[PDB]
Design a binder for this molecule. Structure first.
Ligand code: A1AGJ
Ligand code: A1AGJ
Ligand code: MG
Ligand code: MG
Lengths: 305, 305
């Protein structure tokens, strides 16, 4: 029995119309064109012989408006003249002489661990694929990015407003990925330098495991539900010793509790038991806990909220 | 260690610009507007009191051009006047008086079991999400569709050409989904009537399991590779008794064999052993065989082909 859950991304068209290619010297990557600004990773300025220890302040001062080439390829092709440049943290803000006529309503936000967002993967300013990820507790994502993908963007959508939350920068040794928010800060403790870096421990996202257990109940799969309960405070002490995030309830989780009649604390107890082993049973076709679906995913995809 | 694989859909913008809402009486669902034609499921003509045994021939003859309302909501809003109507299998072909100015280059094709395609889920003519599925051996997909989603479309893309392959029609009792190709045939033995239907057995897609094992090797995970080999003919006899599809090699699989230096027949042997149990080990974080990634997915996402 299929749960009705899939990895569901936002439709990408509004963001596709904002992707451009940015070239500086021998480096090329993607940028995001909104109004008269093009955002891109600052390492586009870095020659390959300096990627391990760039002096971005000196690289910035070495630039002229003539140093940057910006091109839009699809739909409404254009070469965009750069008329100013500035650095914000790990991003460049290029000012261009044409305002993007397809600029959507937008904001910039930071995404938190456990929350999902959609990514538009792009190469040479051309969108090639879209996928959804959850921000991990260690501020990486389990993405799919190759050389040339930097400047690919991640976003959520509220109504017609696009909330841009991620610009892709790097791949870590364990195959995960990280990038910057549009305030220019890297997620986590990462730096935009080509050196090996400490990656913090990942953890199971407890709130998302709870969501998935609710999805199981909504599909008639409830063998793991017992009268037994663990309080949020007690579960959270356990979580710290067992590589789980501390649980913080939300209205979205509460809606699942009301619909199913199963209390959060019943599922916190179930998690503690299931973490020790599923005893040969499956939940929604899985023999391990799943944390890649959010309470909102379950509310939207199964309950049609 | 993350494999670098995600469920990767095509960018959806070109298809978003083709989605419309179609209403006939009390029924509303989605349609696809290409050139001067709008395709939609024929059950838009059916009143709720007849969904279990519609007489579609009589329903069709009962229609006039005045029976259909077609509306485009996003981007370039429009009410489209219907000037003709016809039925092709389980689809209606409505002729409208305006050609869609955003019609992409396109073809219609049928997708085969094991192959992946992208879906644009829509409600009331408004795109709401995108996801990717593989056509199952029993001609269902494991999608995410609710009331109002019929007429949502699935497609692949070759260069700039969109190959439309699926129009959504129904949900089966086990939570999976099916629909029609654009020749109007339903996938499988299904009928577009609101009655319970025999669903054929699903099977593991052997070629996709092979692909995933190659993805594991490309990530340094090869504990399951031994000198032992099973021939394609021998594996295929085994597959018939063990709920696997028969294996048919392709150039895409051969590219993985060349890159890794591991023969297909080594992985056919591994599958037979792994099907009996993983012995407490994991492959790419999983304790069961994975068949939801294609050889092309692995070539593109990991090898950048
Ligand atoms: C931008 O297009 C790419 C995207 C990468 C390429 C492969 N997949 C991706 O997601 N980004 C990079 O190439 C960055 C650029 C720096 C300036 C941020 N480099 C990168 O990710 O490689 C270095 C990474 C940094 C963390 C780490 O562990 N790295 C490996 C490493 C460390 C030290 C030396 C070397 Cl040669 C590699
Ligand atoms: C179109 O928007 C919907 C999409 C569905 C709704 C829920 N999720 C979806 O994917 N399609 C339908 O409602 C179809 C319409 C018919 C005319 C094709 N109906 C449908 O899928 O429900 C009936 C299905 C058919 C196979 C089956 O097992 N069904 C259950 C069933 C059987 C007999 C009677 C009843 Cl009331 C339901
Ligand atoms: Mg990798
Ligand atoms: Mg369901």
């Amino acid at each position: 029995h299929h749960s009705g859950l899939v990895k569901m991304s936002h439709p990408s068209g509004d963001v596709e119309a904002c992707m451009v290619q940015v070239t500086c010297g021998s480096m090329t990557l993607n940028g995001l064109w909104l109004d008269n600004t093009v955002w891109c990773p600052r390492h586009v300025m870095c020659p390959a012989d300096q990627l391990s220890d760039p002096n971005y302040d000196a690289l910035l001062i070495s630039m002229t408006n003539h140093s940057f080439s910006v091109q839009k390829h699809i739909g409404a092709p254009a070469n965009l003249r750069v008329v100013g440049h500035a650095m914000q943290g790990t991003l460049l803000k290029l000012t261009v002489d044409v305002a993007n006529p397809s600029t959507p309503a937008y904001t910039f936000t930071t995404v938190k661990p456990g929350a999902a967002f959609s990514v538009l993967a792009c190469y040479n300013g051309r969108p090639t694929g879209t996928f959804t990820v959850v921000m991990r507790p260690n501020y990486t994502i389990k993405g799919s990015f190759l050389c040339g993908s930097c400047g690919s963007v991640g976003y959520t959508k509220e109504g017609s407003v696009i909330n841009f939350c991620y610009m892709h920068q790097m791949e870590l040794a364990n195959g995960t990925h990280t990038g910057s928010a549009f305030d220019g800060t890297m997620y986590g403790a990462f730096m935009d330098k080509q050196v090996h870096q400490v990656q913090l421990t990942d953890k199971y996202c407890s709130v998302n495991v709870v969501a998935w257990l609710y999805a199981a109940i909504l599909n008639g799969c409830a063998w793991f539900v017992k009268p037994n309960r663990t309080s949020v405070v007690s579960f959270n002490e356990w979580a710290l010793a067992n590589q789980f995030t501390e649980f913080v309830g939300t209205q979205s989780v509460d809606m699942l509790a009301v619909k199913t009649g199963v209390a959060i604390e019943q599922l916190l107890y179930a998690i503690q038991q299931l973490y020790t082993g599923f005893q040969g049973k499956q939940i929604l076709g899985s023999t391990m806990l799943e944390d890649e679906f959010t309470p909102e995913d379950v509310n939207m995809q199964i309950m049609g909220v």
